[PDB]
Structure formats: C-alpha cells, structure tokens
C-alpha cells in the first residue's frame, strides 16, 4: 500500500475537494465523525482505502488532504461543515488577503510568504506515509490563488519530492460561470509554469459541467454545489482504482503509463455516463452498450470538443456497477463499426478496461439518481487541443492591447513572462497538431 496526499488550492479546489471527500466517506462507509465500523483493524492497517485515509488510535479515519486558500471564507466552511470532525486544524491553511484574480499576486507577492508554511504542513502528512506515491492537486485555472499559488507549489513539490508523481484536477474557465475577465491570462500563465511539473492533468471545463447539469439534471441555473457534486463523481471514478481492490491504475505511475505516451501531452479527456436526474423516480436503466456508446458523444465530455477530428493515444474505460467483461467487449465491437475512432499509428488500437462491482454512490438528497452501472472514459485525444486554441485566442485578443498587464507587472512579474507563457502554449498546440494530422 502506498499513500496519496490530496492538495486543494483556492476556492474551486477547496469546494471540489469538499465534495470529493464527502463522496469518499459515503463510498467507504466512513461516518462524518471519522468512524468506519466496517474497518476491523482499528488505528492501523494497509488496506486500499488507507491510500487516502490515515487512522488514529481512536479509530478515526483522517483524509490525507491539505486545504490551502489565501482567504478564510471558503475554508472556514470546511472546519464548520458536516465533515468538520474528519479534519484537524493543521490540515486547513487560510491567509488573510487573497490573490484578487491575479496570477502574479498569487504566485509572487502572496505565494512567497505562505509557501513554506504549506510545504511544512504537507511534510507533516508525508511523515505519516510508509510509501508515498505522490499528490493529487485540485485547483482552478482562472483564480489568482488556484493559478498563481498552485504553480509555485508544484515547483517546490518537484524539488522536495522529486521521485513522486503529481496529478492535477484543473477547472477550465467558462464565462457562464466565470468570475474574472483575466482568467485567460491566469490559465496560460499557470499552464506554462506547471507543464513540466505535472505528470497527468484532468481538465474540467465549467461550460461542459454547466450544460450537463442543465440538460441531464434539468437544473435551469446550476450552482457550484450542483457542479461540484457532478465533478466529484468523475473524480471518484478516476481515483476509485487507488482506493479499492483492483489491477488497473493501481498507483499514480500507472496513470502516466496508460494515458500519457508523450509527457507534454498529459491532458486526457474524461467522458462520463449516465447522468440522470433524481426527480425522475423511475428511469429505465441504460445498458453497458448504451453507456459505452455515450462515451463517444461530445455532450457527455468534461471538455466540449470533437474527438472525431483527432487521434487517440490511449483509452481507459472505468465501469462501476453491474458490468461483466462480456457485455463490454460486445459494446466495443458495435461502437467501433458505427463510430470514427482513429489511433496514432505508433499506438495500438485498444482499450484498457476496469470494472468495480459497487455501483456509483450518490449523496442523499442530491440531484444525481442512483444507477445500476456507470462508466468514465479516459481518452488521450488530440481533440482536446481545441480547448487550448480557444483559451490562447482570448489571450491573444487582450494581450495585443496589453490590457490588464499593469496589474501583473505591479506584483513584480515581468511582461516577458506573458510572451514566454504564450510561446510555450504555441508549442503545445503545435505538438498536438503533429500528433493528430
């Protein structure tokens, strides 16, 4: 058994982190007070769920997680919420003044003053680990803290934990939910600085989650709680293999091995199905073939894009519920003839499949109806480059007039870092082009 430490940065990372750990507790039978009656090894054990939960002599199962935000509004809600009992004070780090939607303010000005404290609190969790795998880092692209401080933390983590893997869950900015005009700046700045430090990053476009919440959940104006509960389901499907008995994606290294042949192209596309409204009360259960077919519908992807016009480098199918290998192979044969699925010539045309029999758990009273079987597809396709293209274009529009640049220069960042970051993204976009010609 090898431990995984989760790190949540900024409002988006912290609120999504809260939803995830809530779902983790429900899935593992851990009550809000940290007690896990089904765990018969009190105060110890090297079970699969111990990769995410440590244990105290009193039987409390404490998440291996750190929360970091530069203002205490959000994190105060964790230390006062349903699962306040799970975390102890040292796990929650709050500053007094936030990054004001400014990457430079989060990275340079405020980042420098709190980085040591964060690394120290992280070192404390690492000391409890017998064989630390690495870190899962949740954050937004658009926030000053989520973008600016995360990039700084990722640099230092590469320094202090050189052999440890680092995976990202990144919230891509969408105007339907956006909070700032400069989020394209922050997204590009933090990607350029984090690119060489992240082994595998799962991007989630708020536009996609927003539309899914409106169409499938019939929620006219989805809130962050609506969005984060759906995101936590996807995150849960992705991390299930680290927390449950299995043979696929059993450690962080396997994610890179199975999903990222080229290191710079480490942004696999996630597709989830089915998402059913809880107000139905009598929905006809989709089959293995039907939920598998839905994995190739753009309307179910975490990032809106057309994979028909790209090349696949890898594809994993993560099922939860009543699924047997026979039905999966039958569905794949059917979908392969109906749909367009092109792999790069230097990669086999195949699917790694993982099945967990426990069907997805849904938070009671939430919006998602419980289903008999669900699937999450992780496919590294060049089509996700469309998201970089959109982002870079908005960047180019503002930067051509140097709009808002004075706010970043005023924090000690040089104007040249803008052009360097944008130039790095131009190369990234070119890397995808060569792969998916």
């Amino acid at each position: 058994m090898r431990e995984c430490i989760s790190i949540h940065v900024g409002q988006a990372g912290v609120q999504i982190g809260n939803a995830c750990w809530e779902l983790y507790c429900l899935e593992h039978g851990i009550q809000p007070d940290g007690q896990m009656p089904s765990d018969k090894t009190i105060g110890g054990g090297d079970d699969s769920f111990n990769t995410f939960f440590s244990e105290t002599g009193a039987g409390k199962h404490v998440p291996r997680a750190v929360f970091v935000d530069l203002e205490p509004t959000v994190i105060d809600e964790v230390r006062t919420g349903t699962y306040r009992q799970l975390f102890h004070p040292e796990q929650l780090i709050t500053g007094k003044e936030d990054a004001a939607n400014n990457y430079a303010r989060g990275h340079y000005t405020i980042g420098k003053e709190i980085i040591d404290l964060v690394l120290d609190r992280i070192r404390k969790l690492a000391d409890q680990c017998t064989g630390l795998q690495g870190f899962l880092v949740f954050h937004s692209f658009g926030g000053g803290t989520g973008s600016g401080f995360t990039s700084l933390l990722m640099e230092r983590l590469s320094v202090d934990y050189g052999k440890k893997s680092k995976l990202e869950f990144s919230i891509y900015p969408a105007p339907q939910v956006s909070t700032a005009v400069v989020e394209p700046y922050n997204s590009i700045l933090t990607t350029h600085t984090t690119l060489e430090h992240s082994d595998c990053a799962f991007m989630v476009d708020n536009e996609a989650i927003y539309d899914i919440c409106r169409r499938n959940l019939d929620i006219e104006r989805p809130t962050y709680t609506n969005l984060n509960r759906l995101i936590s389901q996807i995150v849960s499907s992705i991390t299930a293999s680290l927390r449950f008995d299995g043979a696929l994606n059993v450690d962080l290294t396997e994610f890179q091995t199975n999903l990222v042949p080229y290191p710079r192209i480490h942004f696999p596309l996630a597709t989830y199905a089915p998402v059913i409204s809880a107000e139905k009360a009598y929905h006809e259960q989709l089959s293995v073939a039907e939920i598998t077919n839905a994995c190739f519908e753009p309307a179910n992807q975490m990032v809106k894009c057309d994979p028909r016009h790209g090349k696949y480098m890898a594809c994993c199918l993560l099922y939860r519920g009543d699924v047997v290998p026979k039905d999966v192979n039958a569905a794949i044969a059917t979908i392969k003839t109906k749909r367009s699925i092109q792999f790069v010539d230097w990669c086999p045309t195949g699917f790694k499949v993982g099945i967990n029999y426990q069907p997805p758990t849904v938070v009671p009273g939430g919006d998602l109806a419980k289903v008999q079987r669900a699937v999450c597809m992780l496919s590294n396709t060049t089509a996700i480059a469309e998201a970089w293209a959109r982002l870079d274009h908005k960047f180019d529009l503002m930067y051509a007039k140097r709009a808002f640049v004075h706010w970043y220069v005023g924090e000690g960042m040089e104007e040249g870092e803008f052009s360097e970051a944008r130039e790095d993204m131009a190369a990234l976009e070119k890397d995808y082009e060569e792969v998916g010609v």
């Binding site: 320094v159 449950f244 290998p325 499949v353 099945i355 000690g412």
Partner: protein, 53 residues
C-alpha cells in the same frame, strides 16, 4: 478483438482489449521570487519618491 491480462477479484475485474496492432533548483526558485520582490520594492520606492516631490 483480443482480451488479454484478465484479473479478477471480489471487488471487480480488469482486462485489455486490442482491436488492431500498431527541473529548477530550490535556489533558482527563490532567486526569481526575490527578483520579483525587488521589482515591487523598486516600484514602491519610485512612488514614495514621487509623493515626496
């Protein structure tokens, strides 16, 4: 359609289906952080000098 490496456990099952064959040091970081801090410090000094005038 080939199924390979089938693993079975009480919790689930996993396999593979083939359809067709084929960093900056700590000192360098604190450097750029201090460089940015000095640029802020210089800009603030110019402001205070401007206000002193």
């Amino acid at each position: 359609m080939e199924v390979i490496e089938l693993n079975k456990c009480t919790s689930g099952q996993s396999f593979e289906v083939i359809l067709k064959p084929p960093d900056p040091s700590l000192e360098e970081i604190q450097k750029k952080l201090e460089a940015a801090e000095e640029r802020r410090k210089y800009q603030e000094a110019e402001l205070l000098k401007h206000l002193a005038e």
